[PDB]
Design a protein around this ligand. Structure first.
Ligand SMILES: Nc1ncnc2c1ncn2[C@@H]1O[C@H](COP(=O)(O)OP(=O)(O)OP(=O)(O)O)[C@@H](O)[C@H]1O
Length: 287
Protein backbone atom coordinates (compact mmCIF):
# COMPACT_ATOMS: atom_id res chain seq x y z
CA UNK A 1 0.00 0.00 0.00
CA UNK A 2 1.60 3.27 -1.32
CA UNK A 3 2.03 6.01 1.25
CA UNK A 4 4.35 8.68 -0.12
CA UNK A 5 7.06 9.40 -2.64
CA UNK A 6 10.53 9.52 -1.14
CA UNK A 7 12.95 10.23 -3.95
CA UNK A 8 14.53 9.15 -7.20
CA UNK A 9 17.78 7.21 -7.11
CA UNK A 10 20.52 6.35 -9.60
CA UNK A 11 18.54 3.29 -10.57
CA UNK A 12 15.18 3.37 -8.78
CA UNK A 13 12.15 5.30 -7.68
CA UNK A 14 11.71 4.94 -3.95
CA UNK A 15 8.35 5.11 -2.30
CA UNK A 16 7.36 5.20 1.36
CA UNK A 17 4.69 2.66 2.19
CA UNK A 18 2.99 0.50 4.78
CA UNK A 19 3.22 -2.63 2.56
CA UNK A 20 0.04 -4.57 1.68
CA UNK A 21 -1.14 -5.32 5.31
CA UNK A 22 2.52 -5.26 6.45
CA UNK A 23 2.19 -2.59 9.18
CA UNK A 24 5.92 -1.95 9.39
CA UNK A 25 6.53 1.25 7.45
CA UNK A 26 8.66 0.45 4.48
CA UNK A 27 10.46 1.80 1.48
CA UNK A 28 9.85 0.16 -1.86
CA UNK A 29 12.31 0.54 -4.63
CA UNK A 30 11.04 0.39 -8.23
CA UNK A 31 13.04 -0.59 -11.36
CA UNK A 32 17.47 -12.25 -14.43
CA UNK A 33 19.40 -14.88 -12.41
CA UNK A 34 22.33 -13.05 -10.79
CA UNK A 35 19.91 -10.33 -9.73
CA UNK A 36 17.65 -13.03 -8.28
CA UNK A 37 20.70 -14.45 -6.41
CA UNK A 38 21.61 -11.04 -5.02
CA UNK A 39 18.02 -10.49 -3.89
CA UNK A 40 17.79 -13.84 -2.06
CA UNK A 41 21.17 -13.10 -0.41
CA UNK A 42 20.61 -9.64 0.91
CA UNK A 43 17.42 -11.37 2.02
CA UNK A 44 19.22 -14.24 3.75
CA UNK A 45 21.56 -11.75 5.48
CA UNK A 46 20.76 -10.67 8.98
CA UNK A 47 22.59 -7.95 10.81
CA UNK A 48 21.69 -5.01 13.01
CA UNK A 49 23.74 -2.73 10.72
CA UNK A 50 22.65 -4.15 7.38
CA UNK A 51 19.46 -2.97 5.67
CA UNK A 52 16.55 -5.42 5.71
CA UNK A 53 15.25 -6.64 2.42
CA UNK A 54 11.66 -7.67 3.24
CA UNK A 55 10.36 -8.64 -0.21
CA UNK A 56 10.98 -8.24 -3.81
CA UNK A 57 8.08 -8.72 -6.20
CA UNK A 58 7.52 -7.92 -9.88
CA UNK A 59 6.86 -9.24 -13.41
CA UNK A 60 9.91 -8.69 -15.70
CA UNK A 61 9.01 -5.08 -16.75
CA UNK A 62 9.23 -3.86 -13.07
CA UNK A 63 10.97 -4.94 -9.89
CA UNK A 64 10.06 -3.64 -6.50
CA UNK A 65 12.27 -4.17 -3.47
CA UNK A 66 10.98 -3.75 0.03
CA UNK A 67 13.20 -2.44 2.80
CA UNK A 68 12.31 -1.39 6.28
CA UNK A 69 12.08 2.36 6.26
CA UNK A 70 14.91 4.60 7.52
CA UNK A 71 14.50 8.19 8.83
CA UNK A 72 17.56 9.39 6.98
CA UNK A 73 20.98 8.51 5.71
CA UNK A 74 24.34 9.82 6.80
CA UNK A 75 24.43 12.22 3.86
CA UNK A 76 21.64 14.46 5.03
CA UNK A 77 23.43 14.57 8.43
CA UNK A 78 26.78 15.58 6.89
CA UNK A 79 25.05 17.73 4.37
CA UNK A 80 24.44 21.43 4.78
CA UNK A 81 22.77 20.46 8.04
CA UNK A 82 24.53 22.99 10.10
CA UNK A 83 21.79 22.46 12.66
CA UNK A 84 23.41 19.07 13.09
CA UNK A 85 27.00 19.13 14.35
CA UNK A 86 29.09 16.02 14.61
CA UNK A 87 31.79 15.13 17.26
CA UNK A 88 32.40 11.58 18.74
CA UNK A 89 29.01 10.97 17.15
CA UNK A 90 31.50 10.34 14.36
CA UNK A 91 32.85 7.45 16.47
CA UNK A 92 29.34 5.84 16.63
CA UNK A 93 28.67 5.95 12.89
CA UNK A 94 32.09 4.43 12.25
CA UNK A 95 31.53 1.89 14.95
CA UNK A 96 28.44 0.78 13.13
CA UNK A 97 29.56 1.08 9.53
CA UNK A 98 32.59 -1.09 10.34
CA UNK A 99 30.60 -3.69 12.27
CA UNK A 100 28.04 -3.66 9.41
CA UNK A 101 30.96 -3.98 6.96
CA UNK A 102 32.80 -6.57 9.07
CA UNK A 103 29.75 -8.75 8.78
CA UNK A 104 29.48 -8.17 5.10
CA UNK A 105 33.06 -9.14 4.62
CA UNK A 106 32.78 -12.11 6.91
CA UNK A 107 30.01 -13.20 4.61
CA UNK A 108 32.21 -12.91 1.56
CA UNK A 109 30.36 -9.85 0.27
CA UNK A 110 31.74 -6.50 -0.77
CA UNK A 111 29.34 -3.72 -0.42
CA UNK A 112 30.50 -2.10 -3.59
CA UNK A 113 28.77 1.20 -3.38
CA UNK A 114 29.32 2.84 0.02
CA UNK A 115 28.86 6.56 0.27
CA UNK A 116 27.17 8.64 2.99
CA UNK A 117 23.75 8.16 1.41
CA UNK A 118 24.01 4.39 1.74
CA UNK A 119 24.74 4.51 5.45
CA UNK A 120 21.12 4.89 6.63
CA UNK A 121 19.79 5.62 10.14
CA UNK A 122 16.56 4.34 11.63
CA UNK A 123 14.27 6.18 14.12
CA UNK A 124 16.55 5.02 16.97
CA UNK A 125 19.88 5.87 15.39
CA UNK A 126 20.83 2.38 14.28
CA UNK A 127 23.08 2.70 11.24
CA UNK A 128 22.36 0.16 8.53
CA UNK A 129 24.18 -0.31 5.21
CA UNK A 130 22.20 0.09 2.01
CA UNK A 131 21.71 -2.68 -0.55
CA UNK A 132 25.10 -3.66 -1.90
CA UNK A 133 24.51 -1.74 -5.09
CA UNK A 134 23.90 -4.20 -7.90
CA UNK A 135 21.23 -5.58 -5.40
CA UNK A 136 19.38 -3.13 -7.56
CA UNK A 137 21.38 -0.25 -8.87
CA UNK A 138 23.55 -1.83 -11.59
CA UNK A 139 22.33 -5.42 -11.07
CA UNK A 140 19.19 -4.67 -13.14
CA UNK A 141 20.46 -1.65 -15.07
CA UNK A 142 17.80 0.72 -16.48
CA UNK A 143 18.60 4.11 -15.00
CA UNK A 144 15.94 6.34 -13.32
CA UNK A 145 15.05 9.96 -13.90
CA UNK A 146 16.91 12.07 -11.45
CA UNK A 147 19.08 15.16 -11.18
CA UNK A 148 21.50 15.29 -8.24
CA UNK A 149 25.33 14.98 -8.66
CA UNK A 150 26.58 11.37 -9.25
CA UNK A 151 29.54 10.47 -6.84
CA UNK A 152 32.72 8.38 -7.70
CA UNK A 153 34.18 10.34 -4.85
CA UNK A 154 34.64 7.10 -2.83
CA UNK A 155 36.34 4.97 -5.38
CA UNK A 156 39.61 3.56 -4.15
CA UNK A 157 42.60 4.32 -6.36
CA UNK A 158 42.77 0.69 -7.42
CA UNK A 159 39.30 1.00 -9.05
CA UNK A 160 40.10 4.34 -10.63
CA UNK A 161 43.24 2.90 -12.10
CA UNK A 162 40.75 0.19 -13.28
CA UNK A 163 41.86 -2.83 -11.32
CA UNK A 164 39.84 -5.72 -12.63
CA UNK A 165 40.52 -7.44 -9.25
CA UNK A 166 39.54 -5.90 -5.92
CA UNK A 167 38.56 -6.71 -2.32
CA UNK A 168 37.80 -5.45 1.14
CA UNK A 169 40.09 -2.53 0.48
CA UNK A 170 37.44 -1.20 -1.90
CA UNK A 171 35.01 -0.73 0.94
CA UNK A 172 37.60 0.35 3.40
CA UNK A 173 38.62 3.15 1.19
CA UNK A 174 35.04 4.35 0.85
CA UNK A 175 34.71 4.20 4.64
CA UNK A 176 37.82 6.35 4.76
CA UNK A 177 36.05 8.83 2.58
CA UNK A 178 33.00 8.78 4.66
CA UNK A 179 34.94 9.30 7.86
CA UNK A 180 36.55 12.22 6.07
CA UNK A 181 33.17 13.68 4.92
CA UNK A 182 31.96 13.45 8.52
CA UNK A 183 35.03 15.29 9.89
CA UNK A 184 35.22 17.72 6.98
CA UNK A 185 31.51 18.13 6.33
CA UNK A 186 32.37 18.53 2.70
CA UNK A 187 33.06 15.71 0.26
CA UNK A 188 36.71 14.74 0.94
CA UNK A 189 37.76 14.09 -2.66
CA UNK A 190 35.16 15.66 -5.04
CA UNK A 191 36.67 14.75 -8.48
CA UNK A 192 35.11 15.67 -11.88
CA UNK A 193 36.21 12.47 -13.50
CA UNK A 194 38.19 9.39 -12.55
CA UNK A 195 41.38 11.19 -13.59
CA UNK A 196 40.54 14.34 -11.59
CA UNK A 197 39.54 12.01 -8.79
CA UNK A 198 42.92 10.32 -8.88
CA UNK A 199 44.46 13.82 -8.79
CA UNK A 200 42.65 14.82 -5.61
CA UNK A 201 43.57 11.47 -4.04
CA UNK A 202 47.28 12.05 -4.77
CA UNK A 203 47.67 15.75 -4.03
CA UNK A 204 45.88 15.15 -0.71
CA UNK A 205 47.29 11.83 0.32
CA UNK A 206 50.62 12.07 -1.52
CA UNK A 207 51.65 10.11 -4.59
CA UNK A 208 52.33 6.54 -3.50
CA UNK A 209 55.91 5.33 -4.00
CA UNK A 210 56.52 1.78 -5.15
CA UNK A 211 57.55 1.18 -1.52
CA UNK A 212 54.04 2.33 -0.37
CA UNK A 213 51.90 0.68 -3.09
CA UNK A 214 53.75 -2.11 -4.85
CA UNK A 215 52.33 -3.33 -8.18
CA UNK A 216 50.76 0.15 -8.46
CA UNK A 217 52.02 0.69 -12.03
CA UNK A 218 50.84 -2.39 -13.80
CA UNK A 219 47.32 -1.41 -12.79
CA UNK A 220 45.40 -1.44 -16.08
CA UNK A 221 44.52 2.32 -16.32
CA UNK A 222 47.60 3.53 -14.51
CA UNK A 223 49.03 6.77 -15.89
CA UNK A 224 51.85 8.76 -14.31
CA UNK A 225 51.39 11.52 -11.70
CA UNK A 226 53.41 14.50 -10.52
CA UNK A 227 54.87 13.25 -7.30
CA UNK A 228 52.83 15.15 -4.68
CA UNK A 229 54.09 15.27 -1.12
CA UNK A 230 50.57 15.14 0.29
CA UNK A 231 49.20 16.93 3.33
CA UNK A 232 49.92 15.32 6.70
CA UNK A 233 46.61 13.97 7.91
CA UNK A 234 46.79 16.19 10.95
CA UNK A 235 46.82 19.19 8.64
CA UNK A 236 43.80 17.88 6.73
CA UNK A 237 42.00 16.94 9.95
CA UNK A 238 42.69 19.49 12.69
CA UNK A 239 39.76 18.10 14.68
CA UNK A 240 41.33 14.66 14.67
CA UNK A 241 43.04 12.98 17.58
CA UNK A 242 46.00 10.69 17.03
CA UNK A 243 43.96 7.59 17.65
CA UNK A 244 41.50 8.60 14.88
CA UNK A 245 44.27 9.85 12.67
CA UNK A 246 45.58 6.28 12.93
CA UNK A 247 42.33 4.85 11.66
CA UNK A 248 42.16 7.41 8.82
CA UNK A 249 45.77 6.27 8.23
CA UNK A 250 44.95 2.63 7.76
CA UNK A 251 41.81 3.21 5.67
CA UNK A 252 43.72 5.27 3.17
CA UNK A 253 46.83 3.14 2.82
CA UNK A 254 47.14 2.82 -0.95
CA UNK A 255 48.12 -0.72 -1.20
CA UNK A 256 44.76 -2.50 -0.97
CA UNK A 257 46.30 -5.22 1.27
CA UNK A 258 48.07 -2.97 3.71
CA UNK A 259 44.68 -1.22 3.88
CA UNK A 260 42.94 -1.83 7.16
CA UNK A 261 40.17 -4.43 7.31
CA UNK A 262 36.87 -3.81 8.98
CA UNK A 263 37.77 -6.16 11.86
CA UNK A 264 41.22 -4.66 12.30
CA UNK A 265 39.72 -1.24 12.21
CA UNK A 266 37.27 -2.20 14.86
CA UNK A 267 40.01 -3.45 17.22
CA UNK A 268 41.86 -0.16 16.97
CA UNK A 269 42.21 2.20 19.92
CA UNK A 270 39.74 4.62 18.37
CA UNK A 271 36.85 2.38 19.28
CA UNK A 272 38.01 1.65 22.82
CA UNK A 273 39.53 5.05 23.62
CA UNK A 274 37.78 7.39 25.82
CA UNK A 275 35.26 9.61 24.11
CA UNK A 276 33.14 6.49 23.44
CA UNK A 277 30.42 6.26 20.77
CA UNK A 278 27.32 8.37 21.50
CA UNK A 279 24.60 5.89 22.34
CA UNK A 280 22.61 6.82 19.34
CA UNK A 281 19.26 8.16 19.92
CA UNK A 282 21.54 10.65 21.46
CA UNK A 283 22.62 10.55 17.81
CA UNK A 284 21.29 13.71 16.15
CA UNK A 285 18.42 13.64 13.66
CA UNK A 286 17.83 16.24 10.94
CA UNK A 287 14.49 18.04 10.66
N1 LIG B 1 15.22 2.18 3.28
C1 LIG B 1 14.92 3.48 3.06
N2 LIG B 1 14.26 4.22 3.98
C2 LIG B 1 13.96 5.52 3.75
N3 LIG B 1 14.27 6.19 2.62
C3 LIG B 1 14.93 5.57 1.62
C4 LIG B 1 15.30 4.16 1.78
N4 LIG B 1 15.93 3.80 0.64
C5 LIG B 1 15.95 4.89 -0.17
N5 LIG B 1 15.36 5.93 0.43
C6 LIG B 1 15.18 7.26 -0.16
O1 LIG B 1 15.31 7.13 -1.57
C7 LIG B 1 15.87 8.32 -2.12
C8 LIG B 1 17.04 7.91 -3.01
O2 LIG B 1 17.58 6.76 -2.36
P1 LIG B 1 18.36 5.56 -3.09
O3 LIG B 1 19.15 4.80 -2.03
O4 LIG B 1 17.46 4.74 -3.99
O5 LIG B 1 19.38 6.44 -3.96
P2 LIG B 1 20.56 5.70 -4.73
O6 LIG B 1 21.21 4.73 -3.72
O7 LIG B 1 21.34 6.78 -5.43
O8 LIG B 1 19.76 4.98 -5.93
P3 LIG B 1 19.36 3.41 -6.10
O9 LIG B 1 19.50 2.82 -4.71
O10 LIG B 1 17.92 3.44 -6.55
O11 LIG B 1 20.30 2.96 -7.21
C9 LIG B 1 16.26 9.19 -0.94
O12 LIG B 1 15.30 10.24 -0.81
C10 LIG B 1 16.19 8.30 0.29
O13 LIG B 1 15.66 9.04 1.39
Amino acid sequence: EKLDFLGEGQFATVYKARDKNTNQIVAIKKINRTALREIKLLQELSHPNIIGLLDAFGHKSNISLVFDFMETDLEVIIKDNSLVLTPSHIKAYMLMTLQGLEYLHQHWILHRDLKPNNLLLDENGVLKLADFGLAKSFGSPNRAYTHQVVTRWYRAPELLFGARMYGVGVDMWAVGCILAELLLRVPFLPGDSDLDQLTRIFETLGTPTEEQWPDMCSLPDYVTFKSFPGIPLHHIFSAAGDDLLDLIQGLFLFNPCARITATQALKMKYFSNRPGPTPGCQLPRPN
